[PDB]
Amino acid sequence: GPDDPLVINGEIEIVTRAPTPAHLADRFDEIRSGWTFRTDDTQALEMDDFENSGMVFVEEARAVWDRPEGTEGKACADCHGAVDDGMYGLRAVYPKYVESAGKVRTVEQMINACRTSRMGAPEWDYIGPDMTAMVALIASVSRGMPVSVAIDGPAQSTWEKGREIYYTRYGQLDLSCASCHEQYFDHYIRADHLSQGQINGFPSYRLKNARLNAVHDRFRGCIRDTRGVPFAVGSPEFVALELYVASRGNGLSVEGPSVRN
């Protein structure tokens, strides 16, 4: 049900409904996880890692985390230690302004910066399976922590650009993210129950395509489906949109990898 509690493995409390972030308060009476819009059967799949097929990829990435790769003969673990310690909390605060870059960066950009400059290893395709499994492992060790992305300070112009995108109609169908997810959440489009379009549960394991789905891959698919031309994955436009959409869910718990239609 929409108001039932989500607990994972009998151990991790997930906040699935939260007071609306101050910047969005005019628009929603509260913010809700996508989990709260799913049927009971689908909801149950996220309650135990043994039933969440998304966690099979996470367990694979746990082995990658310890595997030396690249000309430097190093594994992530050689610098960051055990992933449960070294990545604790990170998913809750990205995208964020990164000192060394003088810009807002996503987790995927950071990972590929380490692969090339510190590991001597090939970059992973931004929305490919290797990257998305590693981003899911990083999400999974912060589950239950509230999403807390900064929207002001050095992130402000980026968040504002994201907001402009979220409310811009695109494609020949002429629809904005807000057309569906703000005005019509809790309605149906054909057999799909519209949520608020939150990303606190990403990468999502979709029962439809039986793989993990990267945030930028979901964004590209949504704009394509307006009969429109999406921005490139990893582009400044989708980095900005990710910051802004992440902020629409501030206060919900990290949930990734989640299970969705």
Partner: protein
């Protein structure tokens, strides 16, 4: 002979008092177009019980012909925003003004002339179908 997108005669309620083509509308083809996910895809948003798994974003169209005149129904299909300003229903006879329009779902930019989502004839067919909904 079809009235091209540039040329449609729209009053100030957005109503469109004459047909967009001289070809008579076939309501059987109308019915098909509405549930064709490539053309009308109307059932994504609208229930019609006369006709599976309809959306709830738009109102049920049962009885629509009892409640609105034909000119208003045709106006909704030419450019819904003339009748329901800021609606999420697409403009099915508009060819200008889109941001980043793509060729169907291929993510490729439409370069050159933009064709409307439906033809004049397709619109008169849907209108003829909708007119059966009394």
């Amino acid at each position: 002979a079809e009235v091209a997108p540039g040329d449609v005669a729209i009053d100030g309620q957005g109503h469109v008092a004459r047909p967009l083509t001289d070809a008579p509308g076939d309501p059987v083809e109308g019915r098909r177009l509405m549930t064709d996910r490539s053309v009308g895809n109307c059932i994504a948003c609208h229930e019609v019980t006369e006709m599976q798994f309809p959306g709830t974003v738009g109102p049920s169209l049962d009885g629509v012909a009892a409640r609105y005149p034909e000119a208003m129904i045709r106006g909704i299909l030419v450019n819904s925003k003339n009748v329901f300003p800021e609606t999420v229903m697409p403009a099915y006879y508009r060819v200008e003004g889109f941001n980043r329009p793509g060729i169907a779902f291929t993510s490729k930019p439409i370069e050159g002339e933009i064709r409307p989502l439906m033809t004049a004839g397709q619109i008169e067919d849907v209108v003829a179908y909708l007119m059966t909904l009394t």
